[PDB]
C-alpha cells in the first residue's frame, strides 16, 4: 500500500516506477493484497493495481500495449495487447473490478464496449465467507444465460476473481461453462507451468 | 495562465506532439532506418497513455540516432545527419526525466529570471545599482534598459 499510494500524488517521481516494477518482479506474492485495491479511496490506485496485477500474472505472455480507461461511475477498465511467444502460435485482453455481484451484470454490456481472441478478467468484492458452490452457481447463471462473450466481439475465457484469492474460470464457447482444473488458479499461468503435459492423469490440487 | 500551464505540463501527450511537429517538418535528409524506428517508438508511447508505467521514450530515440551516428557515414553524410536531427536532440534532452522533470525545469527557469534581475538592485539606491550595471555592460545599453 505504501508503494501503490505514494505514487499517486504525482506519478513520475523516477523512484515510484521502479517500486511498481519491484512489485511486479519480486519473489513475494502480493496477490493476497492486490485485490484490495478495488478503489481504496483515491480511484487512481485502481489503475496502478490493475497494471501490477496483470503484469505479474501475465509474466509469460509478452505484453506490448497497456492502457487505462475510465467511466463516470465505478468502472476502472484496463486494456492489454500482448502475444504468445511459443504456445499455440496475437490476443487481446482487459480487466475490470466490480462490487458484490450485481454491479457486474448492471453495466456488463457497457464494459465490453472497448475469432474470439479477447480475454476478460473480472474481480468482485465479496469479502465474506468462502462458499465455492454458491459462487460457482451464481457465475454459471450469468454465463449460461448471457452470451455477450460470443455475439459482441468474441471472448475466449471469462475469469472471476473472488476475494486468499479464489479464482473461477468459465469458457462460454464450446465446453460447459466450468473449469475444475484451474479452480483457485489463474489460467494466465497455464504456460508458465506446463499443465498440458498431464493428459494421462486426473489431477487434484 | 498559470493554471493552464500547470495543466499542460502534467499532460503526458505534450512531448509526443512536440515530436510530431519536429519530425514531420523534416521528412527528407533523415535516413529511413532512424525514421522508421522513431515512428514506431512514438506509436508505442501513444499506446501506453493513461498508464502508471507510461514514460516518454527519449532514451530510445536517442539510442537509434546514436546507433546511426555510431555507423558514422563520412563526408557530407556525417554533418547532414547531425544537423537535421538537432530538433529531436533538443526534445529528448528536455524530457530525459519525463514530464515531471520538464515541469519543474520550466517553473525553475522562471524563478531564475526573477533572480537574474532582482539580485542586481539590492545593495543600495537605484542610481548606484544602475551605474553598476552600466559599468558592467559597457558595450550595450539595451541590457541596462531591460533590467
From Swiss-Prot, chain A:
PTM summary: The biotin cofactor is covalently attached to the central biotinyl-binding domain and is required for the catalytic activity.
Protein's name according to its UniProt entry: Acetyl-CoA carboxylase 1
Record's comment describing the protein's domains: Consists of an N-terminal biotin carboxylation/carboxylase (BC) domain that catalyzes the ATP-dependent transient carboxylation of the biotin covalently attached to the central biotinyl-binding/biotin carboxyl carrier (BCC) domain. The C-terminal carboxyl transferase (CT) domain catalyzes the transfer of the carboxyl group from carboxylated biotin to acetyl-CoA to produce malonyl-CoA.
Stated role: Cytosolic enzyme that catalyzes the carboxylation of acetyl-CoA to malonyl-CoA, the first and rate-limiting step of de novo fatty acid biosynthesis. This is a 2 steps reaction starting with the ATP-dependent carboxylation of the biotin carried by the biotin carboxyl carrier (BCC) domain followed by the transfer of the carboxyl group from carboxylated biotin to acetyl-CoA.
Residue numbers of the full-length protein present here: 1101 to 1393 of 2346
Signal peptide annotation: none
Subunit structure: Monomer, homodimer, and homotetramer. Can form filamentous polymers. Interacts in its inactive phosphorylated form with the BRCT domains of BRCA1 which prevents ACACA dephosphorylation and inhibits lipid synthesis. Interacts with MID1IP1; interaction with MID1IP1 promotes oligomerization and increases its activity.
Tissue-by-tissue expression: Expressed in brain, placenta, skeletal muscle, renal, pancreatic and adipose tissues; expressed at low level in pulmonary tissue; not detected in the liver.
Subcellular location: Cytoplasm, Cytosol
Disease: Acetyl-CoA carboxylase-alpha deficiency: An autosomal recessive inborn error of de novo fatty acid synthesis associated with severe brain damage, persistent myopathy and poor growth.
Domain of life: Eukaryota
